[PDB]
Design a protein around this ligand. Structure first.
Ligand code: HEM
Length: 292
C-alpha cells in the first residue's frame, strides 16, 4: 504493498505552515489553565504519537498520513482516552486553516508543542492526505503499559524503531501526567512536566522507586517526591541494554535532544513516500524567536 505519496496542499509553502504553527502556539500560551495549569503541550504531543503509532510496517496500514483519528472507531479506542482534549484544542485551528489536512494538523500539533515547551527543533514535512473511514486502523495497535522490556522491544519493531529510538522516544514521558480515569494510572513523572528536558531519565535513575498499587488496582512505581513510572517505563532500567542508553541521556541533554528530534520526525513520517521533488523539511521558528 500500500503506497501513500505526500501531496502538498495546493499552492502552500513554508509561510503558510508557520502561520498554523503560530496559531497553535498562541493558543497553547492562552489556554494555560488546562489540566491544573500543565497546559495542552503534553496532550498535543501524545495526540501526534498516537495518530502515528498505529502504523504497521508490514502492510503500511495505519500511520499519520490519513488523519483517521477523526473517525469514531479510532477516536473511541480505549488506548486514546483523554486525547479528545487535544482534538478539541485543534478544532478552531483547523476551522481557521481549513486547507490543512488532518494528518498534517495532528502531527504539526506535536511538533509545535515540543518546540514551544523548549524542546529540540523537530523538522516537519507537509503532504499527508485525508483518507476515507474504511482506512481507519482497528483498535489494539497502541501499546500496553503493564508489560516488560521484551514486550516494549518487540512492540516497537512494528514501528521500525530500534533500542535507541525507543529509549529516546520514551523521554517524552517527562511531559504531563497519567490520569486514573483515562488509563488506570495516576501521577506525573517529574517536576518539570510542561517544559521539555531529560528529567525522565534522571528520575528513573535517581529517585527511590517503590512498587505500589494505585486506586485502580494496577501496579506502578512511586517515589517519595510524588512521581510515578509505568511498568513499561521502569523496564528501561531493568533491561541492561536499555539501561546503558537511559544513563547516556541522563548525562547528555544535547544528545537526547538530537536523538529525540530524529526519532519523533521518523515516527511522524512512517508510511509516507516523499517524492524526490517534494519540498525539504520545514523547521519552524518559535513564537519567542519571532518576538511574538
Ligand atoms: C510503551 C510505550 C508507551 C506506553 C505504554 C505509554 C503509556 C502511556 C500512558 C498509560 C499514559 C497516560 C495517559 C493518561 O492517563 O492520560 C501516557 C501519557 C503520555 N504519553 Fe505515553 N506511552 C508510551 C510511549 C509514548 C511515546 C513514544 C510518546 C511520545 C513520543 C508518549 C507521550 C506521552 C505523553 C506526552 C503523555 C502525557 C499526556 C498527558 O499529560 O495528557 N508516550 N503514556
Amino acid at each position: 504493498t500500500l503506497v501513500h505519496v505526500a501531496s502538498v496542499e495546493k499552492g502552500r509553502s513554508y509561510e503558510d505552515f508557520q502561520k498554523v504553527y503560530n496559531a497553535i502556539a498562541l493558543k497553547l500560551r492562552e489556554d494555560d489553565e488546562y489540566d491544573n495549569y500543565i497546559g495542552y503541550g503534553p496532550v498535543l504531543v501524545r495526540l501526534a504519537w498516537h495518530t502515528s503509532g498505529t502504523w504497521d510496517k508490514h502492510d503500511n496500514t495505519g500511520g499519520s498520513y490519513g488523519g483517521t483519528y477523526r473517525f469514531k472507531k479510532e477516536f473511541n479506542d480505549p488506548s486514546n482516552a483523554g486525547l479528545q482534549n487535544g482534538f478539541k484544542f485543534l478544532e478552531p485551528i483547523h476551522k481557521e486553516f481549513p486547507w490543512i489536512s488532518s494528518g498534517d494538523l495532528f502531527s504539526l500539533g506535536g511538533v509545535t508543542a515540543v518546540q514551544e515547551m523548549q524542546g529540540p527543533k523537530i523538522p516537519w514535512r507537509c503532504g499527508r492526505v485525508d483518507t476515507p473511514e474504511d482506512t481507519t486502523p482497528d483498535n489494539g495497535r497502541l501499546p500496553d503499559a503493564d508489560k516488560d522490556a521484551d514486550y516494549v522491544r518487540t512492540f516497537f519493531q512494528r514501528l521500525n524503531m530500534n533500542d535507541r529510538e525507543v529509549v529516546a522516544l520514551m523521554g517524552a514521558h517527562a511531559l504531563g501526567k497519567t490520569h486514573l480515569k483515562n488509563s488506570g494510572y495516576e501521577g506525573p513523572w517529574g517536576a518539570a512536566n510542561n517544559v521539555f528536558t531529560n528529567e525522565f531519565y534522571l528520575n528513573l535513575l535517581n529517585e527511590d522507586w517503590k512498587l505500589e498499587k494505585n486506586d485502580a488496582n494496577n501496579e506502578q512505581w512511586d517515589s517519595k517526591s510524588g512521581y510515578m513510572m509505568l511498568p513499561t517505563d521502569y523496564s528501561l532500567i531493568q533491561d541492561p541494554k536499555y539501561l546503558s542508553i537511559v544513563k547516556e541521556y541522563a548525562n547528555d541533554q544535547d544528545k537526547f535532544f538530537k536523538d529525540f528530534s530524529k526519532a519523533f520526525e521518523k515516527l511522524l513520517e512512517n508510511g509516507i513516500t516523499f517524492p524526490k521533488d517534494a519540498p525539504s523539511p520545514f523547521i519552524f521558528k518559535t513564537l519567542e524567536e519571532q518576538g511574538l
